[PDB]
Amino acid sequence: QTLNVALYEYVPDPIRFKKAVETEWNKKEPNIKLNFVDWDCYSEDPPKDLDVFVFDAVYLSHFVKEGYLSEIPEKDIKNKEDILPFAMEGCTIKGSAYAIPQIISTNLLFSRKGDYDIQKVNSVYDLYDKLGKFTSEDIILPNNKGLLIDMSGGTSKACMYLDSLIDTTQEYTKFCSLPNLNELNKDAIESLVLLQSMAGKSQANYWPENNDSYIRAKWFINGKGRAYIGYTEAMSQMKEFANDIDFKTISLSKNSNIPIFYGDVVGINSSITNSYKKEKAIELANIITDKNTMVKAVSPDENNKYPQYLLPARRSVYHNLGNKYPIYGKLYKIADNSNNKLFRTGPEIREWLKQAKKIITEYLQQ
Template identity: 45%
Template sequence: MRLYEYGRIFVKTISILLLVVLTVVMTGFSKQEAKVQNHKLTLEVALFPYVPDRVRFQEAVSDAWKREHPDVSLHFADWDCYASDPDPSIDVFVFDGIYLSSFVEEGYLLPIPKEKIRNKEDIIPFVLKGCISRGKFYALPQLLCADFLYTRKDDAGLSDVSDIDTLYKRMGDRKTKSVIPEGKEGLLIDLSDGFFAKTVIYLDALMDETQTYTEYGKLPGTARLSDTVLKRMRNIGRMGGEEQVTYSPEDNDSFIRARWFKDGKGRAYIGYSESLAAMGDYVDKVNLRLFSYGPGKNVPLFYTDMVGIHSKISKDKKALAYDLANVLISEEVLSKMSRPSEGGHTPQYLLTARKSVYDSLGKDYPVYYRLKEIMMSRDNHVFRMGTGARRFIKEMEKVLYEKLIRKSGSQTSDHVPNPV
């Protein structure tokens, strides 16, 4: 081999080595640059404000997120879907599903591709279906609430009650006027938040009256409300007594009526599943079930906390936002939130969108098996409202005030309950 050929081979070899070294160095710089870039990113996230332990929820989310994206920080913002629409400064937020149609219509939500939803098979089918609008997923389901009727196992007279008409026939009007019932008398229910609760009860009761589920794509007119449904709503107030149903404690204890029920006050109680957490071991002495606000079969409805991504999110955050939305509905986060607080013995009894959470908790707290049975019914639906939900609720405040307060007069009637 000639000398110049050795030289050519040597130069070629050196060039290849230099190219390899340069590629490795540039790759290292690129990874480092991406790491620095991510470290500068902060996702703004707003959790649902009405959860039993918000700080604990934040910690559960932060821990799970740090393992997945240690270089991207989270900032927890304050936002309430009942008070205002989503601000563009918030990247990922949790909201009540009654506003899903409105938020889609007004362009606040980014569609979530089906393939971006992790462990989709673990999500309860009706809840996942409830997050679809216009044929696309615009949110992911997290937690749920429903009105449950609580009665005592030793109260045979109410053991078969499954609708509000039968409950009123058995209980009649409450006779005493004190906030806290003097004994096992009357219906404990919280209607102290003005007319929002009354509005959603009206819509729920209207479905039970017609025996038809609707997403209320077209909300009913407020000029002519159902007299039959309004009468049932007045009967709820009569069973509870005006002083009790409108009472709001200074410390905003959402479960004070559950504690009263545990202490032997009131004959029946209507509240969310989380109320069980305030009853301690007394849960073994109560029956809970979904019930109808109408005369017959119940159309089971669930208020659903949904995770959405703001449509105005920047491109460099979009992929991260999909990841965060999945973390917010992960089994890990939902299980941590549902288990007892540190040093406690009672779980939170939250209804979650994932089947696996009920299986995991049921091993230690058997009530969760009963809750899963309720959640897996094919008759269940997500409570939705059509576009203009916020305006409709505002209009209903005025109408219900006229129909339920001004025109109802006294909260008493001549109804005599059946002696059971």
């Protein structure tokens, strides 16, 4: 007896997640084996035999439209009120939940403690007035000069453009219809141009030969650059120096930030029609998203002395972690603001991204 399950693997330590899930699942279903698949939502739709899987909510509309996801009755969501509303709502279409949020994520502006100028920035335009252009092609920035930021990914940049549109238009949208790439919003794309100019084009588009996803976080701690924009989980590689840094969200426009968060959310395959198996999958989905699993997945363990610093979607996890790791107290203040929105895109995202990768990149190459 078996379930095929994919966890979200773009995290500092997916092994800690696997062990946490295995441990909590085994306590409840000692006679059902978990088959852990490496499945990549960014590359392809879920196979019919993938029973339970964690995916980026940008694909939610697509997955629901194609009918890949079973509805999850609200009574089948354990401790539902402990979940951050914007995240649960982001998983809810026309009154029905189609996923349970597990992780949320957003880019932060990181600055060094004592750098009051940077910490008072509200937007990338404020940041630019402070940093100016980095006009070198050096991948390695000078000490305390320039912006560290990873703009190497095609998909990431397209997503940044969407985020930029929302801050520029000052309207949150789920992009049921995705933007026209023949007529780019000049202001919104200007924000990406500015970011790249503060970083230098070479450093902005750099991917390291050793595939270290957090290399810029280490450079930053070592004194390279004036400021660093990256995800909260970058602090997982900052060691004790995480305590010597400040962080905040900033707007991609000259207007007030609409704080957009990626959601990594757990769905259950609609191909499951056997009600017993269906019950087991709903149980697994809750275990993947419950408090104890998240605490174990995120905290240090025998092989890892620092937290992952991923943002949970449950209040209770922050409370538990915040006693032991005070940075989580600060992260909670960012995570719990009622004006937070989950990053959603329409059903046709895959084709749009294909075209957008090329269009946004070539624009930024000028």
